[PDB]
Coordinates of C-alpha atoms in Angstrom, one line a residue:
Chain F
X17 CA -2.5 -30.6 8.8
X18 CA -3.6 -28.2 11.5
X19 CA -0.3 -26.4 12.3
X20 CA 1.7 -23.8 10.2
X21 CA 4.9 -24.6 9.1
X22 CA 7.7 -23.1 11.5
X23 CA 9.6 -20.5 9.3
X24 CA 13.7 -20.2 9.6
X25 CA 13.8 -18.2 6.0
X26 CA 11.7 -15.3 7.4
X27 CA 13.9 -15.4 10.6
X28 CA 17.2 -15.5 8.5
X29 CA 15.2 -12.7 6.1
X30 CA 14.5 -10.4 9.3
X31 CA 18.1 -11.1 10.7
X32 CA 19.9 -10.0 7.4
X33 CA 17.7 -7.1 7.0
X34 CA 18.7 -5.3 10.6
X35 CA 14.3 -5.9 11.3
X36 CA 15.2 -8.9 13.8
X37 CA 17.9 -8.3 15.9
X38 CA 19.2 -10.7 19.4
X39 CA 20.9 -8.9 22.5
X40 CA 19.7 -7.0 25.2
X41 CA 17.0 -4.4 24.4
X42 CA 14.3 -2.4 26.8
X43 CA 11.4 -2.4 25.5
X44 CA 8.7 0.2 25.6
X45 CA 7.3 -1.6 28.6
X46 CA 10.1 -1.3 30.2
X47 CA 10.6 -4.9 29.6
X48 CA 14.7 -6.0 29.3
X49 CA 14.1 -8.4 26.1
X50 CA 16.6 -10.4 24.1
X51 CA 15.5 -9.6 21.2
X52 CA 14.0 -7.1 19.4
X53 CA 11.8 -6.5 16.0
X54 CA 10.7 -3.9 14.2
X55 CA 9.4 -4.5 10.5
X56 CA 9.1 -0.9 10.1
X57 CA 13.2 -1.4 9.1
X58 CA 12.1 -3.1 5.3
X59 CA 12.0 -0.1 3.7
X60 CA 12.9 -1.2 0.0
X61 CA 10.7 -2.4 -2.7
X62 CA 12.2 -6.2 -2.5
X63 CA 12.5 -6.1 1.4
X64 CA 8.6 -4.9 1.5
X65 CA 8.0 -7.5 -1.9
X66 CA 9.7 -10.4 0.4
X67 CA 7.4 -9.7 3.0
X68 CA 4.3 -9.4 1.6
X69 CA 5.3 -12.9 0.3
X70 CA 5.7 -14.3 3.4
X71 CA 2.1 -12.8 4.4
X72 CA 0.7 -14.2 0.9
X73 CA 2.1 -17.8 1.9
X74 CA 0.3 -17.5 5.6
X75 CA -2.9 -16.6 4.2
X76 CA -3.2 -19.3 1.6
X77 CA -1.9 -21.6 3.6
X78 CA -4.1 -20.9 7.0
X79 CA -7.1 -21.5 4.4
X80 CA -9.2 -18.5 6.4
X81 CA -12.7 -17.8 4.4
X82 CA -12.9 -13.7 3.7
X83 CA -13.4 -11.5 1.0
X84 CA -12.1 -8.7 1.2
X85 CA -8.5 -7.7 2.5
X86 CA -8.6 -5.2 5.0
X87 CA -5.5 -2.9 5.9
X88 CA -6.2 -0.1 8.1
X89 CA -4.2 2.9 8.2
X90 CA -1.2 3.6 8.7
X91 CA 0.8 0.3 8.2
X92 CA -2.1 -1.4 6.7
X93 CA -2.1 0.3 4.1
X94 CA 1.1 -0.6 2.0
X95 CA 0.7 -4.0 3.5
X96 CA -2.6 -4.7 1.9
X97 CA -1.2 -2.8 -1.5
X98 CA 1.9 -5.0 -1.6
X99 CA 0.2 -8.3 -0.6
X100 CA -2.8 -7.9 -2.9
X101 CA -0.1 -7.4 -5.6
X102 CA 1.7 -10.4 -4.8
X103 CA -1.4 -12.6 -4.7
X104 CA -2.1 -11.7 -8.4
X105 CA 1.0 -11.8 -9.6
X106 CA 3.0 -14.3 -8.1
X107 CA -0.6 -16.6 -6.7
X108 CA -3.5 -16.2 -9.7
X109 CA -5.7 -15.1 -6.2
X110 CA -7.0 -11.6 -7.4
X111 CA -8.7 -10.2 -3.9
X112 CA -10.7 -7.3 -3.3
X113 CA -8.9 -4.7 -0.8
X114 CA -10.1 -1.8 0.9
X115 CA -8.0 0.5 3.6
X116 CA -9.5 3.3 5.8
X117 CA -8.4 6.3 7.9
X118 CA -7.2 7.4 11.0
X127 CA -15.3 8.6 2.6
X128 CA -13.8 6.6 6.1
X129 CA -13.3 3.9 3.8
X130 CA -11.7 2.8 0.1
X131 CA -11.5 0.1 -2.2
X132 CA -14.0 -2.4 -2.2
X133 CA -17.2 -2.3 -0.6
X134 CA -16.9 -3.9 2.9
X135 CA -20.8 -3.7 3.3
X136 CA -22.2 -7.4 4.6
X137 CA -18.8 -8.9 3.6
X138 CA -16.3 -10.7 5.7
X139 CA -12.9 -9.0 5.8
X140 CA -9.0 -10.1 6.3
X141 CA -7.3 -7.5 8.9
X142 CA -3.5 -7.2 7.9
X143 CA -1.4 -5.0 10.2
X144 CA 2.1 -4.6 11.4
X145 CA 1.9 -5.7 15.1
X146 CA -1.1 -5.9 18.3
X147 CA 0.6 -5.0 21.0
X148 CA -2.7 -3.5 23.0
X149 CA -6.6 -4.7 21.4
X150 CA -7.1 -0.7 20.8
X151 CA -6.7 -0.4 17.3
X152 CA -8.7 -3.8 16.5
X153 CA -11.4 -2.0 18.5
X154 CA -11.6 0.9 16.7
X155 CA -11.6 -1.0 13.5
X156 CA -14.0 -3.5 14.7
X157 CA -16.6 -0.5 15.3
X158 CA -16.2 1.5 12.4
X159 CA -16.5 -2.2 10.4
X160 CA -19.6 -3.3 12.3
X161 CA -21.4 0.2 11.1
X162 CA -21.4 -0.8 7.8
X163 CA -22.2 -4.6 8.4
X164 CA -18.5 -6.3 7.8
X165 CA -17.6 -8.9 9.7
X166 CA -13.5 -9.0 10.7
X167 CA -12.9 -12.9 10.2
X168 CA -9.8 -13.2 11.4
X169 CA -6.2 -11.1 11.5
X170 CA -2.7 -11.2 10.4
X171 CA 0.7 -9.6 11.5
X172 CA 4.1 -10.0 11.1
X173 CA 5.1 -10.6 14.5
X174 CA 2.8 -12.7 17.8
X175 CA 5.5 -12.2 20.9
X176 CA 3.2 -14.1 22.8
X177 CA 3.6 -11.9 26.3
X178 CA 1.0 -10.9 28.6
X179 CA -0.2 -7.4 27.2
X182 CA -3.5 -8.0 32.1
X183 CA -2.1 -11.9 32.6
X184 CA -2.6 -13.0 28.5
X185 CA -1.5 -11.2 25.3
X186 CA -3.7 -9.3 23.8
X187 CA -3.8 -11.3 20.4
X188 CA -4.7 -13.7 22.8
X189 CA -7.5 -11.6 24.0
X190 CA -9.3 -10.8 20.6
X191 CA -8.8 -14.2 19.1
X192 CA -10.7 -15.6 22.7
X193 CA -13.7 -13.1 22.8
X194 CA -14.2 -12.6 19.0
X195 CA -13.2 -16.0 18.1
X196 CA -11.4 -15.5 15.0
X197 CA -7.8 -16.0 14.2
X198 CA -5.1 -14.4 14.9
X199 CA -2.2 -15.3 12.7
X200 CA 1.1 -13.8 12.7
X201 CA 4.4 -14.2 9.9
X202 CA 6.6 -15.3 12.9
X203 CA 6.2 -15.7 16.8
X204 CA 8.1 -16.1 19.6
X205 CA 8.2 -19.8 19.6
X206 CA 9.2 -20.2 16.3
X207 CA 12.2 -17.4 17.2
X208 CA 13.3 -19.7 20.5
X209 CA 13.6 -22.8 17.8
X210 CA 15.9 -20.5 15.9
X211 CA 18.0 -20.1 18.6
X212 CA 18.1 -23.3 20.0
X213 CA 19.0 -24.9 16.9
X214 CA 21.2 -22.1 16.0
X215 CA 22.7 -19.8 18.9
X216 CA 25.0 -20.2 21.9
X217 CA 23.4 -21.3 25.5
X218 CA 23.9 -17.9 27.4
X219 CA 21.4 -16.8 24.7
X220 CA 19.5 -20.3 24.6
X221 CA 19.1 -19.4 28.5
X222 CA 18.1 -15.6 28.3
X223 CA 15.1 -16.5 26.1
X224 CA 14.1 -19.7 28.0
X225 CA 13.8 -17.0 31.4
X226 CA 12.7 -14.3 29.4
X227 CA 9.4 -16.7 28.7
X228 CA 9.0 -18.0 31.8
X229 CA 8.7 -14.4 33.4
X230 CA 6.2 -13.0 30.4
X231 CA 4.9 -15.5 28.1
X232 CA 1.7 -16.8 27.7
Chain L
X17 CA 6.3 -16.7 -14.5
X18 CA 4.0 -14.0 -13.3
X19 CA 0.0 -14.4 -13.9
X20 CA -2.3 -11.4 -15.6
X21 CA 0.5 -10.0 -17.7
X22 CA -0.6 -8.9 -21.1
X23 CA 0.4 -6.2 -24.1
X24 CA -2.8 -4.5 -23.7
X25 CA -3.3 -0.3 -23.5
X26 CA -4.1 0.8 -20.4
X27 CA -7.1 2.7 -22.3
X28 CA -8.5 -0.9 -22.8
X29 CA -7.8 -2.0 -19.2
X30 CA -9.5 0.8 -18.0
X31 CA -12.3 0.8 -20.2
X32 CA -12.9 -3.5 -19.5
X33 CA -12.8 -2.6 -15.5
X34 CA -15.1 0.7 -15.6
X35 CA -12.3 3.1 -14.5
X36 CA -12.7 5.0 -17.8
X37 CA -16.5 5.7 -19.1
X38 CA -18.1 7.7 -22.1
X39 CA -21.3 9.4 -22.0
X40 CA -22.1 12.4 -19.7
X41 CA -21.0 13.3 -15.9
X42 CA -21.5 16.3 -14.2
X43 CA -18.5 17.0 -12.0
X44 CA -18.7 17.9 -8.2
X45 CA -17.8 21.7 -9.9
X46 CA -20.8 21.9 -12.4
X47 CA -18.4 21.4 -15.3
X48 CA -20.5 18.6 -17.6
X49 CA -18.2 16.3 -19.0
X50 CA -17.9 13.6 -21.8
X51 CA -15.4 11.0 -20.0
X52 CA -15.9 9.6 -16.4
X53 CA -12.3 8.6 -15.1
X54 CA -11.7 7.3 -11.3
X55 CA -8.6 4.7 -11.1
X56 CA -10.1 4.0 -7.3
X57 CA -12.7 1.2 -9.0
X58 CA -9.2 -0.7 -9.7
X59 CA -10.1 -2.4 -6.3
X60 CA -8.4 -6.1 -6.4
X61 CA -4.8 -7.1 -6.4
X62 CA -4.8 -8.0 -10.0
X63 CA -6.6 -4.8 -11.0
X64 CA -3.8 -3.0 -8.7
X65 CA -0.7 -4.8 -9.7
X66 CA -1.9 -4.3 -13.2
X67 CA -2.2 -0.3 -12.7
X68 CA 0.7 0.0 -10.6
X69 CA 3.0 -1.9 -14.0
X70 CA 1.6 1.1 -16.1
X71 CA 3.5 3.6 -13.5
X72 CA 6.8 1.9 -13.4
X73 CA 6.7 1.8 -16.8
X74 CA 6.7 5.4 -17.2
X75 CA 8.8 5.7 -13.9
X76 CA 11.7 3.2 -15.6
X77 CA 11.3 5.2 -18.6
X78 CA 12.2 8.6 -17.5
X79 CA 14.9 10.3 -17.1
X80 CA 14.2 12.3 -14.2
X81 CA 16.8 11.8 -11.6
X82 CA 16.2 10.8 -8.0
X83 CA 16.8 8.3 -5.2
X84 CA 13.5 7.2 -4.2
X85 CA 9.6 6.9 -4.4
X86 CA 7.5 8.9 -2.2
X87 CA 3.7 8.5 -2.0
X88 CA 2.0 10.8 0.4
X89 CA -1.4 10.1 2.3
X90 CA -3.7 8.7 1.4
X91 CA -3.7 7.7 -2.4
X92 CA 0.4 7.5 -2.9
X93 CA 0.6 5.2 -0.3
X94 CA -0.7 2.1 -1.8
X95 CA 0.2 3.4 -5.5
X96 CA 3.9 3.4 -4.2
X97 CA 3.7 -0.2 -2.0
X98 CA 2.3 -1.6 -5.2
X99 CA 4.6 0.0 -7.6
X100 CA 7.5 -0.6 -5.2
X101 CA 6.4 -4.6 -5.3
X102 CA 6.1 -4.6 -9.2
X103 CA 9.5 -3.2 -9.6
X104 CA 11.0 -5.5 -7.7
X105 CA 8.5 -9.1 -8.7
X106 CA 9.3 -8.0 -12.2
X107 CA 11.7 -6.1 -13.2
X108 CA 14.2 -6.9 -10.9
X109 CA 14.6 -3.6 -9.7
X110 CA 15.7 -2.6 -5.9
X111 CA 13.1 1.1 -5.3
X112 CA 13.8 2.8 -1.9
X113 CA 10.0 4.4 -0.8
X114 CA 9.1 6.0 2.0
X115 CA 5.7 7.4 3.3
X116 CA 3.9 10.4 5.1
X117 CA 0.8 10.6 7.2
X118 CA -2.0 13.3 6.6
X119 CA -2.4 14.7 10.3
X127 CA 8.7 11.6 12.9
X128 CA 6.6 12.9 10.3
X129 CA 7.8 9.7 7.5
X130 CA 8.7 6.8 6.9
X131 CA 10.4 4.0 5.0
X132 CA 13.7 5.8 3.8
X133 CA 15.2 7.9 5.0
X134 CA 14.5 11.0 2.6
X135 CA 16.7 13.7 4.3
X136 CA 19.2 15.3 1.6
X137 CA 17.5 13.0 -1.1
X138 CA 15.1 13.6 -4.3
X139 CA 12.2 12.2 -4.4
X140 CA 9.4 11.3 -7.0
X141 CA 6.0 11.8 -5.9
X142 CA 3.3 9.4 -6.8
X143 CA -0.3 10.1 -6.6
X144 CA -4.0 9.2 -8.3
X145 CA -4.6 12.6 -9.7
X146 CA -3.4 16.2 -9.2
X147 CA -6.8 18.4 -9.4
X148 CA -5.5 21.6 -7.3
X149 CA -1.7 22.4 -6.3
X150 CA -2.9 22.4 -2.5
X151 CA -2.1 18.7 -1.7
X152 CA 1.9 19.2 -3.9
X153 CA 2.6 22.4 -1.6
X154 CA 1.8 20.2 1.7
X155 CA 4.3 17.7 0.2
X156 CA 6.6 20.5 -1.0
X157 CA 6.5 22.0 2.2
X158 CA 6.9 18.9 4.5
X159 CA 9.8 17.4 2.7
X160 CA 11.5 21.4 2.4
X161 CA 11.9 20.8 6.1
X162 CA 14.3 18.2 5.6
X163 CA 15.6 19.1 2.3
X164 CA 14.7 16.8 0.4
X165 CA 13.2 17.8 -3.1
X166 CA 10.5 17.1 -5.5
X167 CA 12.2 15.9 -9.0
X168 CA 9.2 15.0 -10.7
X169 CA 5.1 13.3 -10.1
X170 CA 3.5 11.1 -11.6
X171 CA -0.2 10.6 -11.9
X172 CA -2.8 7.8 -13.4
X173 CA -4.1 10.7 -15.4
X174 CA -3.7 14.3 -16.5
X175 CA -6.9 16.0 -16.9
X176 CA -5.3 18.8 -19.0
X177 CA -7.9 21.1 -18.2
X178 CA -8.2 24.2 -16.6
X179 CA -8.2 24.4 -12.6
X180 CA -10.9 26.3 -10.5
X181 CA -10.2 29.8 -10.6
X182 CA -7.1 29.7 -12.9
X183 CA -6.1 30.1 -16.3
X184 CA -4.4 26.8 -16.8
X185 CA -3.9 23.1 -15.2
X186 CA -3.0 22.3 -11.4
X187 CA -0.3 20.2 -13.0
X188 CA 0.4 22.9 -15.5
X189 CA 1.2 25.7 -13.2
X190 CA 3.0 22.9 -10.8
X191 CA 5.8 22.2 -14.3
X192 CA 6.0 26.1 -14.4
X193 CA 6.4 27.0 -10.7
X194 CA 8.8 24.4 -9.8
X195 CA 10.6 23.2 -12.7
X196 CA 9.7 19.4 -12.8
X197 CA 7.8 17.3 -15.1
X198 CA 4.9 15.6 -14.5
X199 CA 3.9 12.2 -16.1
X200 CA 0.7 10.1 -16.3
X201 CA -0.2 7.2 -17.4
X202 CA -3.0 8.6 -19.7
X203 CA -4.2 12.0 -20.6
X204 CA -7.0 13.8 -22.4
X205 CA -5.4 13.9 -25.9
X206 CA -4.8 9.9 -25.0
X207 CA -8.6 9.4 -24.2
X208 CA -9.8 11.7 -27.0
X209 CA -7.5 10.0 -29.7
X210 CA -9.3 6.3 -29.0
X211 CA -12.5 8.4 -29.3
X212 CA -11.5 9.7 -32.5
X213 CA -10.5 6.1 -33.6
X214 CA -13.9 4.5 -32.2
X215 CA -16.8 6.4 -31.2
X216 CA -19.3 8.4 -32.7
X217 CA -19.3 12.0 -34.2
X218 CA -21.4 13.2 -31.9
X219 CA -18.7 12.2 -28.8
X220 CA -16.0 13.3 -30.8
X221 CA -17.7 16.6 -30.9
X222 CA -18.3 16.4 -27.4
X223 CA -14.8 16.2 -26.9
X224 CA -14.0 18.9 -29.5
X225 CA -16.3 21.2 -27.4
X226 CA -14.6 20.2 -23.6
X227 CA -11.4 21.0 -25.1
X228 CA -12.2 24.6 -26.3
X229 CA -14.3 25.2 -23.4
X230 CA -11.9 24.0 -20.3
X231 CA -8.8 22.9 -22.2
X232 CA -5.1 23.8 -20.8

């Protein structure tokens, strides 16, 4: 079993809670996307309790070797706390976590250990730089990251998950993708929108 | 059926994961004390979720009114993701949060015209509740209550009385924790020696508020 699971109840979770929506948006880039997601929209304990769920499930599930949970700030931060909470609670997996700042870092001791780097999104490899320096001064290892969202668009001609995962070889997991959104709206949605995503890919995916 | 639930006092807790301590610890401020007390060593998800039940507890208990949780940078932010989760895992309960950053200015919910309850580790000066105080002023939104892992209730540098003291008196709001020094010094009464309950006796008279 080398692949994840494709996942239509985070999609339907997203799409009922306002944090996935379909249309026509533009993008910070510029970009005229049809869709658009922003996680930052989960802003209840049950939404943000749902969610660190679906992390939990990716984690255990992708089998990745680390020991310590690493959320940097901002949005690491609660993500971390909510998903370290789940673990225990829901999981019996008690984890060390530690976040740091924009003491630079709290929780447990990263020193010599190998961490799990949870965030929000990677839309540029800046912040996974400046966490992979301030990581490396103290000895810990990143070994490997995970997001809610992979859009899987050129950032340069590749993404820049894409990027990291190639020249720090580690991976780089995400909640949902862009593929597994396209299934959802094959299997689901009419073909004017089927056709919107199939060009949207062809012009910016990889 | 959740995993690492248990009747236990959070005194116990603490004590089994090295958050709470007896002996002898010079503070940062010279002040020599009998207790060591730092709810940061609660450092895994268990030790967190477990923590983070002791707040909600208080926080379902009260009667303070308001619409959501607020947990400013840096300490409130996890303590309010975690508490948020518990609520919702275990109680069944729905919490609006929201969040600032130290440096719009929050987010989560939307806090604008709403009450808020402010979550934090500990509350040694009033400096970090005005920054709050004043931050969410700018949107009217108001302070209804904090709560804290502990309340010191000692005197503050250069005052007469507690930072959470003279925040109850200044503003009008009560301020909860999940344990206090009467707490701590009533399982040392139960269980330690003379000597440390002396100790204690001597703290009290000497920094008390």
């Amino acid at each position: 079993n080398l692949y994840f699971q494709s996942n239509a109840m985070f999609i339907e979770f997203a799409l009922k809670n306002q944090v996935l929506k379909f249309g026509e948006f533009t993008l910070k880039s510029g970009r005229i996307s049809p869709y658009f997601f922003n996680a930052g929209l989960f802003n209840t304990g049950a939404q943000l309790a749902t969610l660190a769920d679906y992390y939990a499930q990716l984690i255990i599930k992708s089998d990745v070797k680390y020991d310590i949970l690493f959320g940097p700030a901002y949005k690491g931060i609660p993500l971390v706390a909510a998903i370290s909470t789940v673990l225990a609670l829901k999981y019996n997996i008690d984890m060390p976590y530690a976040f740091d700042r924009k003491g630079v870092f709290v929780g447990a001791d990263m020193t010599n250990k190998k961490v799990l780097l949870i965030d929000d999104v990677m839309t540029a490899g800046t912040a996974f730089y400046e966490s992979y320096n301030k990581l490396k001064i103290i000895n810990a290892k990143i070994a490997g990251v995970v997001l809610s969202i992979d859009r899987q668009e050129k950032a340069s001609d590749i993404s820049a998950t894409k990027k990291i995962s190639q020249d720090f070889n580690i991976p780089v997991l995400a909640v949902t993708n862009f593929e597994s959104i396209f299934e959802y709206v094959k299997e689901n949605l009419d073909e004017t929108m089927i056709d919107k995503f199939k060009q949207y890919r062809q012009k910016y995916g990889s």
